[PDB]
């Protein structure tokens, strides 16, 4: 078939917890930080 895209972004470093991409590993680490104690069980509770 035909799609029209040969993945022009894929990188050796891509986050999973949130699903992001980066060029260097160091850039991926500092990013994962955003996922620090920021995962509440429920959005609207209590
Ligand atoms: Zn992430």
UniProtKB/Swiss-Prot annotation:
Zinc finger intervals, C2H2-type: 13-35
Localization per Swiss-Prot or TrEMBL: Nucleus
Superkingdom assignment: Eukaryota
Function: May be involved in transcriptional regulation. May have a role in embryonic development.
Similarity comment: Belongs to the krueppel C2H2-type zinc-finger protein family.
Protein name, UniProt field: Zinc finger protein 28 homolog
Top-level taxonomy: Eukaryota, Metazoa, Chordata, Craniata, Vertebrata
Gene giving rise to this polypeptide: ZFP28
Portion of the full sequence shown: 752 to 784 of 868
